[PDB]
């Protein structure tokens, strides 16, 4: 829409973009530090200088909007720009330590890369490696560490904490050369900070370090892949960094990172270790490993001859493709199908009768937000990064206080006005499920509000779509097991442990003829199983999830992955005609055993050593803002 010139090269640029943006899009590398596409412009690092021929002056390109016929020059054709790059990089290196041999950022460092390409190439300002100091304060944290001398004070962290996450946990300690980043409240691990790791990722250097990753490897020795995070229903796309077992690094997941969209929470940033914890990667019968073909025969016999006495407990942490294949097999076996979400979510959606599920992008269109139930920031954290309008609240409010929500009553909803988005969490309605659903159903028809159900488990909404009308009540299935109406159980994941304690399954192992547990872990519920079948985690399957970021499909790249979908499809080759189903219902009221927490929301994050430390510190805290 607008034509410009960068080193006498004509380039078309859409009006509204900056010279730096246009240059990067066209492969013209301009060194930069403080500009981040997701944050507000700062103009502080000054590394993006370009020579604007039209005004004969050095100007920062990150703040320069494109204008028809403008002519700029970069370091490619301007010595002035080259001299300032050498000076700016030398200035940053003045008190920067000789820490590259042990710094976690080596190989992916903006200062190290830019300093080697555009830097002075030699030391002009002679500072001994032993005098590389800058004012500094311990962040008092077990997960984050700040190295102020490595800091190139760029304010990306401060901007991200204030503009993206909104926790306002950092501040710049005393001005001038020694400006250093400090947590607003220490110890940091129990402050307003949500340990999302965004500050680690936006930092262009190794100033903010992830302690769990410190010294274990080198950035260039890891493999990288991107997929869908399934630890909650948001659907963020994250990058897993792993090793293979060769000379470079161990066969495990070493850390995880968000993309430049900064869509990530602590579960996604520090929960990577749940992928390495006691994995079940082979089919087993008892304690002995068995060939998948033999296990497929056992299951084929169970469902073919005893399907009408078999119950299937789905997991909301399963991708669409597996859910569908298992459900199709169930309908070919005349089995019982259920899911723990039948206790609360399904009852709510049955009464609401019709809901809205817009993408995060569509949140811009809302005028106000109404949070009903739990602390949204603790259930679908990243959503709290996009609810920037007025927020009303009915229910528990702990980390959501960062949004300064206004408490209201159900009677007040009748008076709100204009494109209201109601975000409701059915797992937190305790006995008022039908009443609340009925009230929101009226509101959706009379006033036209958007009623968006926020499940706490990744694919629960899809489970509901595929199980509505045919699902059995979880307590009815368990009651049917005690009565002897159900002799075999195929349980997927540990979603069920949110309603029944372990002992129940220790006894079920004796009562049932066949207890089949499909899990990713060798510990937990699978310890009580007769037949153990592996269940895939993120990065180990190509499964799609119905999330807040749309219908996202993951990527399979972790090499130790067990082919979950291939196994079930193979079993399904033995089931062609649809036979039917059995449904059990019951009015018994099952109470949730534990409330989800920001650092522990499901059986997967529970197996994360990192999040468990964060959870133990903050489990008792209920007030973070006042």
């Amino acid at each position: 829409k607008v034509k410009i010139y960068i080193d006498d090269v004509e380039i078309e640029a859409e009006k509204g973009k900056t010279v730096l943006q246009v240059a990067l899009e066209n492969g013209i590398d301009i060194p930069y530090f403080c500009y981040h596409p997701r944050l507000s412009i700062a103009g502080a690092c000054r590394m993006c200088v370009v020579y604007w021929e039209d005004i004969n002056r050095l100007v920062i390109s990150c703040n320069l909007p494109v204008q028809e016929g403008m002519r700029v020059r970069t370091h490619r054709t301007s010595e002035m720009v080259r001299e300032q790059q050498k000076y700016l990089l030398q200035a940053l290196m003045t008190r920067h330590p000789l820490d590259c041999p042990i710094c976690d950022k080596a190989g992916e460092c903006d200062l190290q890369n830019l300093g080697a390409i555009y830097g002075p190439q030699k030391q002009i300002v002679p500072i001994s490696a032993l005098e590389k100091e800058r004012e500094e304060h311990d962040w008092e944290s077990d997960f984050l560490e700040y190295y102020s001398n490595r800091c190139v004070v760029c304010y990306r962290c401060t901007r991200a904490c204030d503009e993206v996450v909104g926790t306002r946990a950092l501040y710049v300690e005393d001005r001038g050369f020694h400006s250093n980043i400090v947590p607003a409240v220490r110890p940091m691990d129990t402050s307003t900070c949500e340990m999302c790791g965004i500050c680690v990722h936006v930092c262009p250097v190794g100033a903010i370090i992830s302690k769990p990753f410190k010294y274990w490897s080198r950035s260039w020795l890891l493999e990288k892949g991107r997929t869908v995070c399934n630890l909650c229903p948001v659907g963020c796309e994250i990058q897993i960094e792993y090793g293979v077992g060769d000379w470079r690094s161990k066969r495990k997941v070493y850390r995880t990172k968000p993309t430049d969209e900064l869509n990530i929470c602590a579960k996604g940033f520090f929960g990577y270790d749940s992928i390495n914890h006691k994995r079940l990667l082979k089919t087993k019968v008892g304690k002995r490993e068995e060939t998948p073909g033999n296990v497929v025969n056992l299951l084929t016999t169970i469902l073919t001859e005893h399907g009408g006495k078999t119950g299937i407990v789905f997991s909301a942490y399963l991708p669409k493709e597996v859910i569908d294949e298992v459900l199709r097999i169930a309908k070919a076996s005349q089995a019982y199908v259920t899911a723990p979400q039948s206790v609360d979510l399904f009852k709510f959606l049955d009464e609401l009768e019709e809901y809205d599920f817009p993408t995060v992008k569509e949140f811009e269109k809302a005028d106000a937000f109404v949070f009903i139930g739990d602390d949204i920031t603790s259930v679908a954290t990243v959503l709290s990064y996009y609810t920037k309008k007025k927020v009303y609240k009915i229910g528990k409010s702990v980390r959501d206080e960062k949004l300064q929500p206004e408490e209201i009553t159900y009677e007040d909803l009748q008076n709100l006005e204009g494109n209201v988005f109601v975000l409701v969490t059915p797992h937190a309605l305790n006995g008022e499920i039908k009443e609340v659903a009925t009230k929101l159903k009226e509101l959706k028809r009379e006033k036209g509000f958007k009623v968006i159900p926020v499940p706490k488990d990744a694919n629960a909404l899809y489970l509901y779509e595929v199980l509505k009308g045919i699902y059995s009540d979880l307590p009815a299935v368990m009651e049917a097991c005690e009565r002897g109406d159900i002799e075999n159980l195929i349980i997927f994941g540990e979603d069920i442990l949110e309603f029944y304690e372990d002992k129940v399954f220790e006894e079920l192992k004796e009562k049932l003829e066949h207890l089949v547990v499909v899990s990713p872990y060798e510990d937990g519920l699978s310890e009580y199983a007769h037949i153990k079948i592996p269940m895939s985690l993120m990065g180990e399957n190509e499964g799609t999830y119905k999330t807040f970021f749309g219908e996202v499909k993951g990527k399979k790249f972790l090499p130790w992955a067990f082919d979950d979908l291939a196994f079930w499809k193979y079993l399904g080759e033995n089931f062609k005609e649809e036979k039917g189903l059995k449904v059990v219902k019951s009015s018994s009221n099952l109470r949730r055993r534990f409330e989800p927490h920001l650092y522990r929301n499901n059986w997967i994050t529970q197996r994360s050593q990192n999040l468990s430390r964060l959870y133990e510190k903050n489990k008792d805290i209920t007030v973070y803002y006042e």
């Binding site: 030398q90 290196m93 920067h96 190290q112 490696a129």
Partner: protein
Amino acid sequence: MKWVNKGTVERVKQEFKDEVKYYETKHTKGFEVSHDFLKPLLKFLKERERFLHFVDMTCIDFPEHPNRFQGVYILYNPEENERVIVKSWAKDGKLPTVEDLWPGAKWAEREAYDMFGVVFEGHENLRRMFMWEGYEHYPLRKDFPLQGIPEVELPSLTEVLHGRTDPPSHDFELVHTKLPTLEDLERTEKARLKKKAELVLNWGPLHPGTHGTIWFLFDLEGEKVVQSDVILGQLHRGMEKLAENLHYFQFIPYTDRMDYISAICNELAYVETVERLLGVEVPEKARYIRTMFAELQRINSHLLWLGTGALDLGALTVFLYAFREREKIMDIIEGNAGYRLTSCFLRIGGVHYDLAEGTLDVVKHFIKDFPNRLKEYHTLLTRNRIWLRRTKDVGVITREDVHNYGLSGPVARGSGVPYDLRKLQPYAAYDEVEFDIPVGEVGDVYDRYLVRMEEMAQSVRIIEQCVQKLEKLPKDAPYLNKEHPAVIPPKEDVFHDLESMVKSFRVVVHGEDAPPGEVYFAGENPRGELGFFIYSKGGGKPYRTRIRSGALYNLSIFPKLIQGRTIADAIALLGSLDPVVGETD
């Protein structure tokens, strides 16, 4: 050394109007032609434009293109000192043969078929060059792994003999690439020459001769040779493919292992080429250190050719003297580079270290004696005239064979052609140093022996000039261009400041920031023109590094010389062509 002149470009465009496209790069000038016009353009460039001297030809693999293989040709105009490069796409995996235009190009076509799978219609029994008859792959293809396809378990027999079944080293891979059989070797031998005479002489694959690894085939009538062929590959390790997987600075030690007899020369050719691609200036002190050490290697390399050449006819007394002098050159190189044979002295941007204390005193002690000892070898050899007559009339190479076969080094100079890149295409410091180019008149085995002899004398005069220049420089003068981002600074710099450390990390982790483009540069190695054709798509690793061996083309003329002659002259002929199994990649 300029490229295509503006005049010949237009005469080529006026003749191939919509079929050729002139183009320029930072370092090369040439043409892109349509497949059906490749040969007419080459015949035009050679016969009607004087690009008679054949330099090299090879292929580049572009899997993302429909044709997938671009033929690359490089010719030279000795009358004007110009180079041309011609590119063309292969039509259905084929290309036109050029061996009738340049006989020396026959072996280049064999190498290409073995590495890429390109067939040359009309190659006159095209067979694989290095691999055996029946190999199922084309290693230079981008989808072929560098380690091949491991298929057989090949444990260490020494470890099995002691019951130790566990791997002996953390990097020991039990699965290995499949191994051929003695029968497999027999098919490549028989599929090489079609029976023409009585007996099939077989001097290889392994023979007790001087160049034991070089395999020869003679078709004899009693004692006369009618037909003759050579089979290489007894040392093929995948050099060109190893470069595709390494950073530029990492390949320097592999250049030492090409012509292991003159490693510093190999490094100079390679480094001088990479420094052109990256645009790296070399400080003065390093330029003289390169020029001096490159010449000490030429003396050291000619001594080996003379010692092994003398060993071929008894007279072991010359072998001892030649190696007595080689031990002196190695004492200087080892003391400065740190290794006797595989020096690994040059670095991108200069030299590894400065000269070691007292190194100039040792060279001066060498430059004063060596002139007297050269007079010993002249008369100690000519003393026995039983062999002097065995060389003054055989193996004559006409100037037509020099350009048709792409000969270089002493092989070309012995025949009258003063083709010396140290003067025609200067590098390190050969422009600021004065020396002479020895040239012969008959062009026989004797002329090549005499050519190499004065080259040692001329090299002593070059070293003498480098010594006085080095003494006049302060020991403060640089031997490394530390101001360029692609030059790894010495450890002493990194131990001191962050400004140097970040450079070391950048280059070591990501490689040098090479720009896109192509470059062809060659060094006057003791055995000929050692060329390096590097193709860069941008990044720390080259997309293709073709190595043009001057010795390889010097051997391609062997079947022409021994034909119609007696087999007794084969030992003297091969020796006068100074070939090295290592330069056959």
